Design an enzyme around this catalytic site. Structure first.
Site, PDB file in Angstrom:
ATOM      1  CB  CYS A 193      -0.956  -0.007   1.179  1.00 28.22           C
ATOM      2  SG  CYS A 193      -0.160  -0.516   2.715  1.00 28.22           S
ATOM      3  CG  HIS A 209      -4.310   0.732   4.239  1.00 28.55           C
ATOM      4  ND1 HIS A 209      -3.500   0.515   3.150  1.00 28.55           N
ATOM      5  CD2 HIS A 209      -5.581   0.765   3.756  1.00 28.55           C
ATOM      6  CE1 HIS A 209      -4.239   0.446   2.049  1.00 28.55           C
ATOM      7  NE2 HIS A 209      -5.503   0.612   2.387  1.00 28.55           N
ATOM      8  CG  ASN A 231      -8.201   1.169   0.042  1.00 27.71           C
ATOM      9  OD1 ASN A 231      -6.967   0.978   0.184  1.00 27.71           O
ATOM     10  ND2 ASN A 231      -9.089   0.544   0.783  1.00 27.71           N
TER      11      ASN A 231
END
Lengths: 98, 221
Positions: B25, B164, B188
């Site tokens: 991520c 994240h 995202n």
């Protein structure tokens, strides 16, 4: 804790034991050998597009293995998958990403 | 400052991507912010290589599919003198041999700027005046996995333990009142099938919810 990193180890819970049980067939498949029960001892999680569980299990002959189980996101309708494993592990080996 | 911002409407943002089973991520967050700043500089939007970051940024302290930081990615781009396009260096969600080639580099930075830690007002100013901003958050809750629409608010969320890295592409509010139901508009990296076409609105000005302004930064281009 870091982005995409593994969590701190936590002692196994019944949910984790459950994940190990559900996934046991797949492990027997990869290793050729077959197991009495595997006791889930501790685990770490890693967030991806879904979740990686890294679980330390005990073969009940004092042998330990580290399992990597992928849990997909809600909409993919896929069951739990054993995406990796390591065998011949020490009771005190740290769970690490692999 | 504007009461609403959405950098997608100004051409700063690539389509949502998908990191799959790799803890990369941080690389998606980093290329997202760099795509925005390169677009600001040149007016050309070019999708950048997360794989380049995953394979090549261990010297700067990242760990490929085992995690990393957006600041360390911007540092790699600085020290490396460039970063390849996705088209030239495609993503396969596993750690591989570094294939950086300078002749395919399409982005540069000179380092990065950190947003004042914990400060949602600083983060708002950064979003409004700079462009998309890289942030880390607590995304490990079941409620986040199941997110579909509205303003995400998780009473268990941590401002401190951040697992994240995502991209703030704007902010605004639901309803008629610009100080009610405020949110951060977040890209995202779990594909467009997750959340709201790959996006999620996170509660804004609610005591730094899920640590959104804890560790935000952006590359200097």
């Amino acid at each position: 804790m870091i982005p995409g990193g593994l969590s701190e180890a936590k002692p196994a819970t019944p949910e984790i034991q459950e994940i190990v049980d559900k996934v046991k067939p797949q492990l027997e498949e990869k290793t050729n050998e077959t197991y009495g029960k595997l006791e889930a001892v501790q685990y770490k999680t890693q967030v991806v597009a879904g979740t990686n569980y890294y679980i330390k299990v005990r073969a009940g002959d004092n042998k330990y293995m580290h399992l990597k189980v992928f849990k997909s996101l809600p909409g993919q309708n896929e069951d739990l998958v054993l995406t990796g494993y390591q065998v011949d592990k020490n009771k005190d080996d740290e769970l690490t990403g692999f | 400052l504007p009461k609403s911002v959405d950098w997608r409407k100004k051409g700063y943002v690539t389509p949502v991507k998908n990191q799959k089973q790799c803890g990369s991520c941080w690389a998606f967050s980093a290329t997202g912010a760099l795509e925005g700043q390169m677009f600001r500089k040149t007016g050309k939007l070019v999708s950048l290589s997360e794989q380049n970051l995953v394979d090549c940024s261990r010297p700067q302290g990242n760990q490929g599919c085992n995690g990393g930081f957006m600041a360390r990615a911007f540092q790699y781009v600085k020290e490396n003198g460039g970063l390849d396009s996705e088209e030239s260096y495609p993503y396969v969600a596993v750690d591989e041999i570094c294939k950086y080639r300078p002749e395919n580099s399409v982005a540069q930075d000179t380092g990065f700027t950190v947003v004042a830690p914990g400060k949602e007002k600083a983060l708002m100013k950064a979003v409004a005046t700079v462009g998309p901003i890289s942030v880390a958050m607590d995304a490990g809750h079941s409620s986040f996995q199941f997110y579909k629409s509205g303003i995400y608010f998780e009473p268990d969320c941590s401002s401190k333990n951040l697992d994240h890295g995502v991209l703030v592409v704007g902010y605004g509010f639901e309803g008629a009142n610009s100080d009610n139901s405020k949110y951060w508009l977040v890209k995202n990296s779990w594909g467009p099938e997750w959340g709201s076409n790959g996006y999620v609105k996170i509660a804004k000005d609610k005591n730094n919810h899920c640590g959104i302004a804890t560790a935000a930064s952006y590359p200097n281009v």
